[PDB]
């Protein structure tokens, strides 16, 4: 792929997402979704191999089905109201269709399998862009249409996402599948808080995006896609492993790190609405995510795995490409708990 073509495809993905986030018309929002998917497929297929082709095929099928359901919901809403503006939807059936379509686009359970499948299939840069941006857009649509969300359906899908992400991440050994299940669990948390505070949804989105960017860029720096490949990083550049360890501790929600702020604020907000069982279950279930984060931390930094002999040549050579904003993402993902009241600025 030509660099000009790649940058124009990235620009087109961002253009689709921005069209979704600036449009006041359902047709224009659907157009933005379609443009985003159309420019996103080749990004997945950039490094051509059967795994990448299969991941792109599964992603295309899922997103096409979601777009069909979304346009059906738009049409049904138009039939009963004659309105194209994105507001509270006027038909419960259309609202259910839209909720299911946006949940499928996000990867909320039980629409999650494509997330680990595609994330394993595609490279690290593709997975980073996929997770971050393709969560960025449908959450914007949901925040706009939150006041008509069915709380029962939204919270059911959110709790399912949390449980399934925890269990899948428990089982996986592949780093990309681990990141995908982490994404599923975090999306569950965000959509669980969504029907109450879109501000808390946005706060969790920002913190999750920062932590995910830091983790993916650390993986790209170490060029490790498996647990054992990451187990050799301590013998080449031990600083990256320590930074990954503190980022993993933050992503598990351990105080006083940045990952505790979204969980804390969401639990507080849901408690304000007389919800106790759901916050307690969500808090207890995240211990699975913390467990497999800790298991990954044991293999990479807290213990020394055996290495090989060509690692001496690797010692002799130095990393060339410089990650952009990696130190900033590492600092923002661990040390911004004292800056919590800025969510009012986020309001």
């Amino acid at each position: 792929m030509n660099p000009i073509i790649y940058t124009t495809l990235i620009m087109t993905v961002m253009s689709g997402t921005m069209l979704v986030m600036i449009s006041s018309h359902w047709l224009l929002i659907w157009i933005g979704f379609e443009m985003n998917l159309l420019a996103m497929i080749p990004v997945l297929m950039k490094n051509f191999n059967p795994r990448a082709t299969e991941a792109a095929t599964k992603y295309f099928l899922t997103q096409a089905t979601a777009s069909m359901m979304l346009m059906m919901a738009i049409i049904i809403n138009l039939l009963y109201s004659g309105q194209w503006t994105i507001t509270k939807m006027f038909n419960p059936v259309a609202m259910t269709m839209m909720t299911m379509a946006l949940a499928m686009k996000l990867g909320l359970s039980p629409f999650h399998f494509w997330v680990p499948e595609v994330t394993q299939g595609i490279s690290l840069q593709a997975g980073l862009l996929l997770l971050t941006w393709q969560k960025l857009a449908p959450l914007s649509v949901l925040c706009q249409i939150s006041q008509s969300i069915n709380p029962n359906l939204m919270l059911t899908m959110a709790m399912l996402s949390i449980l399934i992400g925890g269990w899948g991440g428990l089982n996986q050994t592949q780093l990309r599948k681990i990141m995908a299940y982490s994404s599923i669990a975090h999306m569950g948390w965000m959509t669980a808080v969504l029907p109450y505070n879109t501000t808390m949804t946005i706060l969790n989105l920002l913190i999750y995006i920062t932590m995910t960017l830091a983790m993916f860029m650390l993986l790209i720096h170490s060029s490790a896609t498996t647990t054992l490949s990451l187990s050799h990083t301590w013998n080449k550049m031990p600083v990256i492993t320590s930074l990954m360890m503190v980022t993993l501790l933050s992503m598990g929600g351990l105080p006083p790190l940045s990952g505790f702020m979204p969980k804390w604020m969401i639990i507080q907000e849901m408690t304000k609405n007389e919800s106790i069982i759901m916050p307690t279950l969500m808090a207890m279930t995240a211990l699975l995510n913390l467990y497999f984060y800790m298991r990954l931390a044991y293999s990479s930094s807290l213990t020394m795995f055996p290495s090989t002999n060509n690692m001496k040549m690797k010692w002799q050579f130095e990393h060339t490409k410089q990650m952009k904003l990696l130190p900033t993402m590492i600092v923002l993902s661990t040390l911004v708990l004292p800056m919590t009241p800025a969510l009012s600025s986020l309001n």
Binding site: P3, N235, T303, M304, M311, K312, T320
Partner: protein
Amino acid sequence: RLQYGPLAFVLGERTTRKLTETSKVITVDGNICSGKGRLAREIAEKLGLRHFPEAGIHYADSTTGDGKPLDVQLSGNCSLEKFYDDPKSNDGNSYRLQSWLYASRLLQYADALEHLLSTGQGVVLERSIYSDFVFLEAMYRQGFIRKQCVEHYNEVKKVTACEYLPPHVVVYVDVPVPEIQSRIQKKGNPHEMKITAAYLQDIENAYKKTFLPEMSEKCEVLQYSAREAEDAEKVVEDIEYLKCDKGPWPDQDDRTFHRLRMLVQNKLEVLNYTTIPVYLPEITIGAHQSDRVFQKFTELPGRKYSPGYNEDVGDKWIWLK
């Protein structure tokens, strides 16, 4: 620009524009103690190409830091002399040496490709990663290494060498084994005097039966005897009058050259799969020894920081760099 990358590519730097149709990759091959080195020297100097001597141990030492070789405990952890003295060691010296030499040849091939794609000048290598496997088969058929070692070699070679361009010219110097042994005896080095005749025969069999048939399909192959290789004028004349348009180099484009140059200029991405988590007893190093040797390497003079930031080797202006 100021460094090759996508920005330079979109600015307009093109490898096809840089090339001058004399940019060829020539690899000279032969059995142990042949005239291949002198032939490569003569070919490189007559055609004006850059000569790359055979990538033995400490080649990476020569290309990094100061050119002086490092300690064997820190660079290679293997000994050709020990391989000659005790080929069937119980410490995996044979396959450690073989894998390290393959990695060194991979690094040298990456360096040669980078030089050709950045300067347009041809390169004459004294051996390549495509000829390296003959010593692997020679070790395997003599019982020096194991089938697991051979399988690991094959996996690494696949995932690494599948990404590079084969040489334009493969020049093989054919010398009979009795002549090889006579030259070895004349040289008088004891370790290579301990080389057996079957080990030399296995290398020639691997060259004749696999390497030469494989290279013939890809591009031109030139074979010379001792007398023919001694007269390099006719060899250079033969090279200058080679007609071939069946190689992948004519099929290469500007985007393919951009991808290849981005790959070869990144030395850590070249050696990415040389260290895969396959735990052979020959090549695996324990945690404690790994930590100690890494500490020693970091304690080496100009190795603690990046090249521009080592004060103990006379680097100034660090606080503004």
